[model samples]
Target chain A: DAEFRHDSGYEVHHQKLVFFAEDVGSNKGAIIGLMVGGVV
Target chain B: DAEFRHDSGYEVHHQKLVFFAEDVGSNKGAIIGLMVGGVV
Candidate 1:
């Protein structure tokens, strides 16, 4: 079922670096999770 | 730093009707979830 509906327009959304690992020995991270309308 | 980037294009996504309930003795349910570019 269609749980999400958006208007026919443009929206500006952005996010900053919360936890970043650059030139390190080993690196591991998780993706930023999100939900549209309710769940994701 | 910016966390996500996308090319100029379009995408189509959909989901099936998992659980749905109407006015049946005051019942409740959850909604579908979605993620775009790692986030909503």
Candidate 2:
């Protein structure tokens, strides 16, 4: 059997995110209203 | 004056974080203790 260990205390962490939109002009009215459409 | 625009709707985002601790063995009892310090 093997036991977990942290003899050398060093660590690093990271995170990421992505956002996209396409054909907003074609799929306009039904999805985005007056306020959101104006901002985007 | 120039007006703000997003003619090509494309965007990306990212984020990161880091942590560190040293001489934990020498300054053990004062900083970390049983039950509370077991995981860190």
Candidate 3:
């Protein structure tokens, strides 16, 4: 399956959908956490 | 069958990996530090 995605500062058409909310708490938090965690 | 993987920063597709993101330096740096500096 494929889809399009959008965010406050970005977008993707064939991007990978990593659902962090399942591991963390909320979607927003997951997004933030990803940003924070990703930045390392 | 379906599939689900966490951390949009990384993924495996059809026995291969498909990577994409913003700012190569930032994106790569983020994932780098994320894997190395993920402890508190």
Candidate 4:
């Protein structure tokens, strides 16, 4: 999943990141984005 | 953590990271954040 992926909201603390998937690809999208973090 | 390292925060710039671990099942501490851009 590196379509030129880039997102570094440093000082990160991304929490409870519970992600799952199970469906052979082929025109069907439902996996959002945007989860930056900070703490340093 | 053999995990990974080095982040190119935009066209190539850096500074902003804070991780700690050295007790109570070390390698468990947080606080991180950064920034970058895209569309080239």
Candidate 5:
């Protein structure tokens, strides 16, 4: 059945795509939050 | 004045809040994507 799915094509080759975004970066707010605990 | 702000709050003590979430966890796809680069 492996070859049967060959038409599935380059999509699998392109591969898993994960997305994430960061909102904090040395901003004083982040530091302050971390300081109190893992709040931020 | 420093004393003036004393009446303004205790909320500052609670502090800054930042939020983020994880979408992947060694679920195979993540590894494959990372293998190709920082895709996942």
Candidate 6:
């Protein structure tokens, strides 16, 4: 019998993320930054 | 019938890779740079 070791994928170490919040409360609304890397 | 789309993983777009080659041609031997991202 043989023993084996397993590893994962590449890792991305990032810091804080800034977003442009353009909500006028009664007109515009939009914001985006880091997000879920899954199916949408 | 339906058409599907397939994608790959994260990509690192690097320009150049400098290596410290210490080969003496008759003694020392060592070199390393970008390599195969697979199992050994």
Identify the leading candidate in terms of lDDT.
Answer: 2
User: Per-residue alpha-carbon lDDT of model 1 for A1-40, expressed as tens digits?
Assistant: 4334333433343333222233332222333343342223
Q: Model 1: runs farther than 4 Å from truth?
A: A1-40, B1-7, B21-24, B27-40
On the 0 to 100 scale, the lDDT of residue B29 in model 6 is 28
The best-first sequence of candidates by TM-score reads: 6, 1, 4, 2, 5, 3
For candidate 6, the TM-score is: 0.20
Predicted candidate 5 versus true structure: per-residue lDDT over B1-40, tens digit per residue: 1222112211221223333344332322211211221121
Task: Name the lDDT of candidate 5.
Answer: 0.25
- Itemize residue pairs with steric clashes in candidate 1: A39-B33, A40-B33
What RMSD does model 3 have?
A: 19.2
The 10-residue segment of model 1 chain B with minimum total lDDT is: B18-27
True contacts kept of 5: 0.01
Interface RMSD of each: 21.3, 13.8, 19.2, 20.9, 28.5, 23.5
Q: What is the TM-score of chain B in candidate 2?
A: 0.21
Per-residue C-alpha lDDT of model 4 across residues A1-40, encoded as one tens digit per residue: 3244455653322332222233233433333342333222
Q: What's the residue-level lDDT of A27 in candidate 3?
A: 24
Reference-based lDDT, residue A2, model 2: 90
| A1-40: candidate 2 lDDT, tens digit per residue | 8999858867665656454554334322233333322234
User: Could you tell me the TM-score of candidate 4?
Assistant: 0.19
For all candidates in order, the CA lDDT equals 0.33, 0.44, 0.28, 0.32, 0.25, 0.31
Candidate 4 chain B worst ten-residue window by lDDT: B31-40
TM-score of each: 0.19, 0.15, 0.14, 0.19, 0.15, 0.20
